[PDB]
Amino acid sequence: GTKKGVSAAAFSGVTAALGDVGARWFYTWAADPQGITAPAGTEFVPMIWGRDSVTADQLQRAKAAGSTLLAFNAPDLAGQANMSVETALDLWPQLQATGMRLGAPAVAYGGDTPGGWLDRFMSGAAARGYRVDFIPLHWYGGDFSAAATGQLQSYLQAVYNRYHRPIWLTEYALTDFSGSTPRYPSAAEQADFVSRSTAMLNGLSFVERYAWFSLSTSTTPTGLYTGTTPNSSGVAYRAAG
Ligand SMILES: OC[C@H]1O[C@@H](O[C@@H]2[C@@H](O)[C@H](O[C@@H]3[C@@H](O)[C@H](O[C@@H]4[C@@H](O)[C@H](O[C@@H]5[C@@H](O)[C@H](O)O[C@H](CO)[C@H]5O)O[C@H](CO)[C@H]4O)O[C@H](CO)[C@H]3O)O[C@H](CO)[C@H]2O)[C@H](O)[C@@H](O)[C@@H]1O
Ligand SMILES: [Zn+2]
């Protein structure tokens, strides 16, 4: 019912796609829907992406566009928000001052690692008396077998066990980035993982929300829909609770 969402971008048919797949919520990596008209029953969640995303105007835009706030995207990656724990802590009061339910920055990896980016952020927030309501995560599996769903579950459990905040999974797919270019599963491998991973997540009481990366093949080869047509993975996501 309540957990299943998606990342999305404006394309011809986005509204129908969101409706047909049964998304309860969506985000755009921006402070507003970036031209997308949401179907009825589909909640937009704003994001404050990076350092230069933190202005009065963006924070007010976000608060008018929704009731929950996602903080910086992959601050631990040079190619994304690319930010120190200290820069993220120093901007935090501006995000807190909106009064919105507030999600931690979403780390690319290492969320459970002592001394990692997330651990220093949460440790510093607690010492400053800051509020962090939930922890959003990213996960991309390189093992394309039936074992993948268990590997994802282990990472989510470890982050819950470390910080005891409710968990969102705001990007997930099978993709191996270890090599010089990305490596993807066969279509049948992907659809089996969609089924087994959603069943696992729908039943895990400390996961509040999840978002397959991503709605549309025009964003990523792991896309669920081309225009308004679902592939076997979109079919599997639509059939999830
Ligand atoms: O200071 C750091 C950099 O600041 C930049 O300017 C900011 C500007 O980039 C930002 O615009 C938004 C885009 O960042 C955003 O792009 C989304 C991607 O972040 C996302 O990346 C995922 C990633 O999270 C995951 O780990 O790996 C995925 C798989 O490889 C990867 O794809 O992908 C999304 C899908 O393509 C993509 O949309 O999109 C937003 C929505 O359009 C943009 O708003 O906005 C900021 C202002 O609010 C700018 O400060 C500079 O360009 C850089 O030079 C700096 O290094
Ligand atoms: Zn400082």
Coordinates of C-alpha atoms and ligand atoms in Angstrom, one line a residue:
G1 CA 0.0 0.0 0.0
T2 CA 2.0 3.0 1.4
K3 CA 5.8 2.3 0.7
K4 CA 6.2 2.1 -3.1
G5 CA 7.5 5.2 -4.9
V6 CA 9.8 6.2 -7.8
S7 CA 12.3 8.9 -9.0
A8 CA 11.0 10.7 -12.1
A9 CA 11.6 13.4 -14.8
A10 CA 9.2 15.2 -17.1
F11 CA 8.6 13.2 -20.3
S12 CA 5.5 12.7 -22.5
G13 CA 3.1 10.3 -20.4
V14 CA 4.9 10.7 -17.0
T15 CA 1.5 11.4 -15.3
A16 CA -0.1 8.2 -16.8
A17 CA 3.0 6.2 -16.0
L18 CA 3.0 7.3 -12.3
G19 CA -0.8 6.5 -12.1
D20 CA -0.5 3.0 -13.9
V21 CA 2.5 1.8 -11.8
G22 CA 0.6 2.7 -8.6
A23 CA 3.3 5.0 -7.1
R24 CA 2.1 6.4 -3.7
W25 CA 4.9 9.0 -3.9
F26 CA 7.7 10.4 -6.1
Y27 CA 10.7 12.9 -6.1
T28 CA 12.7 14.7 -8.9
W29 CA 16.1 15.5 -7.1
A30 CA 14.7 19.2 -6.9
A31 CA 12.6 21.4 -4.6
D32 CA 9.5 21.1 -6.9
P33 CA 8.0 18.6 -9.4
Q34 CA 10.0 20.0 -12.4
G35 CA 6.9 20.3 -14.7
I36 CA 5.3 16.9 -13.7
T37 CA 1.5 16.9 -12.9
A38 CA 1.1 14.2 -10.2
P39 CA -1.9 11.7 -10.4
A40 CA -4.4 11.9 -7.5
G41 CA -3.1 9.9 -4.4
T42 CA 0.6 10.5 -5.5
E43 CA 2.7 12.5 -3.0
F44 CA 5.6 14.8 -4.2
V45 CA 8.6 14.9 -1.7
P46 CA 11.0 17.9 -2.2
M47 CA 14.9 17.5 -2.2
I48 CA 17.6 20.1 -1.2
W49 CA 20.3 18.6 -3.6
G50 CA 23.6 20.3 -2.7
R51 CA 25.3 23.4 -1.0
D52 CA 24.0 25.9 -3.6
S53 CA 20.4 24.4 -3.2
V54 CA 20.2 26.1 0.3
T55 CA 18.5 29.5 -0.2
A56 CA 15.3 31.1 1.4
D57 CA 13.6 30.8 -2.0
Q58 CA 14.3 27.1 -2.4
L59 CA 13.4 26.3 1.2
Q60 CA 10.0 28.2 0.8
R61 CA 9.4 26.5 -2.6
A62 CA 10.0 23.0 -0.9
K63 CA 7.6 23.8 2.0
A64 CA 4.8 24.9 -0.4
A65 CA 5.4 21.8 -2.6
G66 CA 5.2 19.1 0.1
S67 CA 5.3 18.2 3.9
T68 CA 8.6 15.9 3.9
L69 CA 12.2 17.1 3.1
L70 CA 15.1 15.1 1.6
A71 CA 18.6 16.6 2.2
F72 CA 21.8 16.4 0.0
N73 CA 22.2 13.8 -2.7
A74 CA 25.4 11.6 -2.4
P75 CA 27.6 14.2 -0.6
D76 CA 30.2 11.4 -0.4
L77 CA 30.6 11.3 -4.3
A78 CA 32.8 13.8 -6.2
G79 CA 30.3 13.7 -9.1
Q80 CA 27.3 14.5 -6.9
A81 CA 26.8 16.9 -3.9
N82 CA 30.6 16.5 -3.2
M83 CA 30.4 18.0 0.4
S84 CA 32.2 17.6 3.8
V85 CA 30.3 16.5 7.0
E86 CA 31.2 20.0 8.4
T87 CA 29.6 21.9 5.4
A88 CA 26.5 19.7 5.7
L89 CA 26.2 20.2 9.5
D90 CA 26.8 24.0 9.2
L91 CA 23.9 24.4 6.6
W92 CA 21.5 22.0 8.6
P93 CA 19.8 24.6 10.8
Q94 CA 18.3 26.3 7.6
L95 CA 16.7 22.9 6.6
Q96 CA 15.6 22.2 10.2
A97 CA 14.0 25.7 10.4
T98 CA 11.4 24.7 7.8
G99 CA 9.7 22.5 10.5
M100 CA 9.2 19.6 7.8
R101 CA 9.9 15.9 8.6
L102 CA 13.6 15.8 7.6
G103 CA 15.7 13.1 6.0
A104 CA 19.4 12.8 6.4
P105 CA 21.7 13.4 3.4
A106 CA 21.6 10.2 1.2
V107 CA 25.1 8.5 1.1
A108 CA 26.2 6.4 -1.9
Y109 CA 27.7 3.7 0.3
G110 CA 29.3 2.9 3.7
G111 CA 26.3 4.0 5.8
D112 CA 27.1 1.4 8.5
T113 CA 30.9 2.0 8.5
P114 CA 32.3 3.5 11.7
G115 CA 34.1 6.7 10.8
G116 CA 32.3 6.8 7.4
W117 CA 30.5 9.9 6.0
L118 CA 27.0 9.0 7.5
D119 CA 28.5 8.0 10.9
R120 CA 30.4 11.4 11.4
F121 CA 27.3 13.3 10.2
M122 CA 24.9 11.6 12.7
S123 CA 27.5 11.8 15.5
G124 CA 28.0 15.5 14.9
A125 CA 24.2 16.2 14.6
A126 CA 23.6 14.5 18.0
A127 CA 26.5 16.6 19.6
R128 CA 24.9 19.8 18.2
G129 CA 21.3 18.8 19.4
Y130 CA 20.1 18.7 15.7
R131 CA 17.0 16.8 14.5
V132 CA 17.3 14.0 11.9
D133 CA 13.9 12.3 11.5
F134 CA 14.8 9.5 9.0
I135 CA 17.8 8.1 7.0
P136 CA 17.4 7.8 3.2
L137 CA 19.9 5.3 1.5
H138 CA 21.2 4.3 -2.0
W139 CA 22.0 0.7 -2.9
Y140 CA 23.2 -0.9 -6.3
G141 CA 23.9 -4.7 -6.3
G142 CA 26.6 -6.3 -8.5
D143 CA 25.5 -9.9 -7.7
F144 CA 22.7 -10.5 -10.1
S145 CA 21.6 -13.9 -8.5
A146 CA 18.5 -14.7 -6.2
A147 CA 21.0 -13.8 -3.3
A148 CA 20.8 -10.0 -4.2
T149 CA 17.6 -9.3 -2.0
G150 CA 19.3 -10.7 1.1
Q151 CA 22.4 -8.5 0.5
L152 CA 20.2 -5.4 0.3
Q153 CA 18.3 -6.4 3.5
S154 CA 21.7 -6.8 5.4
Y155 CA 22.8 -3.3 4.5
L156 CA 19.3 -1.7 5.6
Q157 CA 19.3 -3.7 8.9
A158 CA 22.9 -2.6 9.7
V159 CA 22.0 1.1 9.2
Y160 CA 18.9 0.7 11.3
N161 CA 20.9 -1.1 14.0
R162 CA 23.5 1.7 14.1
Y163 CA 21.3 4.9 14.3
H164 CA 17.8 3.6 15.1
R165 CA 16.1 6.0 12.6
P166 CA 13.4 4.7 10.2
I167 CA 14.8 3.9 6.7
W168 CA 14.0 5.1 3.2
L169 CA 15.6 3.5 0.1
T170 CA 15.5 6.5 -2.3
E171 CA 17.6 4.8 -5.1
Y172 CA 18.0 1.1 -5.8
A173 CA 18.6 -1.3 -8.7
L174 CA 21.0 -4.1 -9.9
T175 CA 24.0 -2.3 -11.4
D176 CA 27.8 -3.2 -11.1
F177 CA 29.8 0.1 -11.2
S178 CA 33.1 -1.7 -10.2
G179 CA 34.4 -1.8 -13.8
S180 CA 35.3 1.0 -16.3
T181 CA 31.6 1.2 -17.4
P182 CA 28.3 0.2 -15.8
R183 CA 27.2 -3.5 -16.0
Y184 CA 23.4 -4.4 -16.0
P185 CA 21.3 -7.6 -15.4
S186 CA 19.4 -9.4 -18.2
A187 CA 15.6 -8.3 -18.4
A188 CA 14.5 -11.5 -16.7
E189 CA 17.1 -11.2 -13.9
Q190 CA 15.9 -7.6 -13.3
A191 CA 12.2 -8.5 -13.2
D192 CA 12.9 -11.4 -10.7
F193 CA 14.8 -8.9 -8.4
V194 CA 11.9 -6.4 -8.7
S195 CA 9.5 -9.0 -7.4
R196 CA 11.7 -10.5 -4.6
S197 CA 13.0 -7.1 -3.4
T198 CA 9.5 -5.3 -3.2
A199 CA 8.1 -8.4 -1.3
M200 CA 11.1 -8.1 1.1
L201 CA 10.8 -4.3 1.6
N202 CA 6.9 -4.2 2.0
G203 CA 7.4 -6.7 5.0
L204 CA 10.4 -4.9 6.7
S205 CA 8.7 -2.7 9.5
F206 CA 11.6 -0.1 9.8
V207 CA 11.5 0.7 6.0
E208 CA 8.9 3.5 5.6
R209 CA 9.4 4.1 1.8
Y210 CA 11.4 2.8 -1.3
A211 CA 12.0 4.2 -4.9
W212 CA 13.3 2.0 -7.8
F213 CA 16.0 3.9 -9.9
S214 CA 14.1 4.9 -12.0
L215 CA 10.6 5.4 -13.6
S216 CA 11.8 5.9 -17.2
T217 CA 14.4 4.2 -19.6
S218 CA 15.0 7.8 -20.8
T219 CA 16.8 8.3 -17.4
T220 CA 18.6 4.9 -17.1
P221 CA 18.8 1.4 -18.8
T222 CA 17.2 0.1 -15.5
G223 CA 14.0 2.1 -16.4
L224 CA 10.5 0.5 -15.7
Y225 CA 8.6 2.3 -18.5
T226 CA 9.3 3.5 -22.0
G227 CA 6.8 6.3 -22.5
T228 CA 3.5 4.9 -21.0
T229 CA 4.5 1.2 -21.8
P230 CA 5.9 -0.9 -18.9
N231 CA 8.6 -3.6 -19.6
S232 CA 8.6 -6.8 -17.6
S233 CA 10.2 -4.8 -14.6
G234 CA 7.5 -2.1 -14.8
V235 CA 4.9 -5.0 -14.7
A236 CA 6.6 -6.5 -11.7
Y237 CA 6.7 -3.1 -9.9
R238 CA 3.0 -2.4 -10.6
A239 CA 2.0 -5.8 -9.2
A240 CA 4.0 -5.1 -5.9
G241 CA 1.7 -4.1 -2.9
Ligands
LIG1 O1 28.4 21.4 -5.8 C1 28.3 20.1 -6.4 C2 28.0 20.4 -7.8 O2 27.0 21.5 -8.0 C3 26.4 21.4 -9.3 O3 25.3 22.2 -9.5 C4 24.0 21.8 -8.9 C5 23.1 21.0 -9.9 O4 23.8 19.8 -10.4 C6 21.8 20.6 -9.3 O5 20.9 20.2 -10.3 C7 20.3 19.0 -10.1 C8 21.1 17.8 -10.6 O6 22.2 17.6 -9.7 C9 20.2 16.5 -10.5 O7 20.8 15.4 -11.1 C10 20.3 14.1 -10.8 C11 21.5 13.3 -10.3 O8 22.0 13.9 -9.0 C12 21.2 11.9 -10.2 O9 22.4 11.2 -9.8 C13 22.3 9.8 -9.5 C14 23.1 9.5 -8.2 O10 22.3 10.1 -7.1 C15 23.5 8.0 -7.9 O11 24.4 7.9 -6.9 O12 24.1 7.5 -9.1 C16 23.1 7.4 -10.1 C17 23.4 6.3 -11.1 O13 24.6 6.6 -11.8 C18 22.9 8.9 -10.6 O14 22.2 9.0 -11.9 O15 20.7 11.4 -11.4 C19 19.4 12.0 -11.8 C20 18.8 11.3 -13.0 O16 19.6 11.7 -14.1 C21 19.6 13.4 -12.0 O17 18.4 14.1 -12.4 O18 19.0 16.6 -11.1 C22 18.2 17.7 -10.6 C23 16.8 17.6 -11.2 O19 17.0 18.0 -12.5 C24 18.9 19.0 -10.7 O20 18.2 20.1 -10.0 O21 21.1 21.8 -8.7 C25 21.9 22.5 -7.8 C26 21.0 23.7 -7.4 O22 19.8 23.4 -6.6 C27 23.3 23.0 -8.3 O23 24.0 23.6 -7.2 C28 27.6 21.8 -10.3 O24 27.2 21.4 -11.6 C29 28.8 20.9 -10.1 O25 29.9 21.5 -10.8 C30 29.2 20.8 -8.6 O26 30.3 19.8 -8.6
ZN2 ZN 31.8 24.8 10.6

